Design a protein around this ligand. Structure first.
Ligand SMILES: OC[C@H]1O[C@@H](O[C@H]2[C@H](O)[C@@H](O)[C@H](O[C@H]3[C@H](O)[C@@H](O)[C@H](O[C@H]4[C@H](O)[C@@H](O)[C@H](O[C@H]5[C@H](O)[C@@H](O)[C@H](O)O[C@@H]5CO)O[C@@H]4CO)O[C@@H]3CO)O[C@@H]2CO)[C@H](O)[C@@H](O)[C@@H]1O
Length: 95
């Protein structure tokens, strides 16, 4: 239960715009969104869900395309991977 929160003091990975990386349930990802609307994409086929610290909660992705996340702030975002059955490749983007 310790360090279950996700934020600027305990993120374990940093995403680069448009660059896929291997992700697992429990990860806490830092991503800077400069402008536009956040997008979360994966093609591995593994369903996943996310909470953004101080932002949108219960985001889901099917593993077969992009999820658009309206109302995510610009700047540094901290995105917790709430659930996923196995490691999967994901990318964060914005447009
Ligand atoms: O990675 C392994 C995995 O890849 C699968 O392939 C994926 C691929 O990874 C994805 O990148 C690709 O997804 C693309 C989307 O289909 C497409 O909609 C989106 O396009 C964006 C575009 O990048 C963006 O610039 C654009 O913005 C404009 C705004 O809309 C305007 O309002 C604004 O005014 O101007 C900007 C331009 O400055 O928006 C569009 C949407 O409108 O781009 C994605 C890529 O960046 O999909 C592939 C699958 O379909 C592959 O299939 C798997 O095999 C593989 O394992």
């Amino acid at each position: 239960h310790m360090s279950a929160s996700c934020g600027s003091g305990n993120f374990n990975k940093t995403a680069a715009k448009g660059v896929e990386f291997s992700a697992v349930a429990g990860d806490c990802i830092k991503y800077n969104k400069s402008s536009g609307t956040l997008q979360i994409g994966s093609w591995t086929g593994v369903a996943s869900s996310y909470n953004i610290t101080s932002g949108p909660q219960g985001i889901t992705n099917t593993g077969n395309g992009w999820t658009t996340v309206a109302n995510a702030a610009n700047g540094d975002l901290y995105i917790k991977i709430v659930s996923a059955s196995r490691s999967f490749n994901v990318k964060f983007d914005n447009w």
